[PDB]
Amino acid sequence: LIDTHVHLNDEQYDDDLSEVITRAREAGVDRMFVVGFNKSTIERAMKLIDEYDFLYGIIGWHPVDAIDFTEEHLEWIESLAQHPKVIGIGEMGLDYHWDKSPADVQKEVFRKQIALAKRLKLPIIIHNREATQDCIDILLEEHAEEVGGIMHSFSGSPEIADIVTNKLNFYISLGGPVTFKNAKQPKEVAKHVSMERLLVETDAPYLSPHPYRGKRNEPARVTLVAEQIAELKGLSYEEVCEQTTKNAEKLFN
Template sequence: MLFDTHAHLNAEQYNEDLNEVMERAQEAGVSNIVVVGFDRPTITKAMELAEAHDFIYACVGWHPVDAIDMTDEDLDWIEELAKHPKVVAIGEMGLDYHWDKSPHDIQKEVFRKQIRLAKKVKLPIVIHNREATSDIVDILREENAAEVGGIMHCFSGSVEVAKQCLEMNFYISLGGPVTFKNAKKPKEVALEIPLNKLLIETDCPYLTPHPYRGQRNEPSYVKLVAEQIAEIKGMTLEEIAQATSDNAKRIFGIN
């Protein structure tokens, strides 16, 4: 059984056919999905989905692109939601230097606040990183994020950076890009990182794997990610599915 550790089924791209998308996921062997909320509307929807479906869990946090919009009330709300039995992680949080909506210093401040919150509520964290690797690694070290650990979501960095993250109690999650023909780094990471530290995800509706690249992504396609990793590691799909599901349940505290 497959575990999609990072999906945005709360996105408007699924407004018309969400039930069919979830049915296709289960038909493809996806037993669990974590839906990630990253602002007020998406967190609310993630909670609704987690409460309505046994196989869906929620991750709640604040996206770095929108860090400038986060208030103390928002942080208090996330802390309150963290008590819910279906909330399994805090995030996605981190740094995004690609877009310039939120100044870097504000992103860093909001990132640190969420790490401290996660330590307070004893939940793992889910990291969004875009063009900010060294600052993210530094902040994770300075804030002793290893205390709760977490997931480097849709990891696109080098094997060397991945190993630094492993040392800080993080799992490496790979998505659609590992299936792209010219994606050298994700393939190297898939090969080098120990199986007990790997996770799989879609980040749907984004980062659709080959051969559907350019179309809307969905959780059923996480099987394509698992198949590619199996090929890289010289293992069976079943072995990858079992190991990554076990890893996901371990980090998220799901029995």
């Protein structure tokens, strides 16, 4: 089992990182993909991947911080990407919940990263918050299908899901929301989407799945996400772990 999207580089783990890692390790979580989307979070991610063998890095620039993105950050990320542990360019996309960065700048920075991924020949990890259509529109126009990737913690509909799996040959990743009771969409997506297109994550410290809602997430909780998807699709737990793992390795290597 792999946690394909985890912020171990977050400040909330300063004090107990090694223990958090260990608990995930003992629970069956073999590999984890740390996401650096900032100057600071990127540096932390690079350190962590050199620190732990089973830790891989995905680096890029978060849409919320699109205004801070400069040509120097672009070049910097480009050379950093040479690291054999950096397997994807990420947490790029659009986010309309915060206003730090206007939609205009976000789109620009988004396009630039897609071009970066193309040159680096690496898949992209997409962050989308309340900007679904604008986001798919850009992945189509820039021919993102050329690099492939993940619609991380997918917060849209199955109709949009098919667009991501059919036109774009992208995978869909689910986290805690799939265990939420009153939010039916994440579950409907879990059931609709082919097991050959799904991946699991926690995006910890955020969005803990039941029965830990309201508490800081931890990659070990990804087991709960797998469990729920197994029940939702009438599959075995072991089958889900193996399928999502097969998928992650095929997308990243």
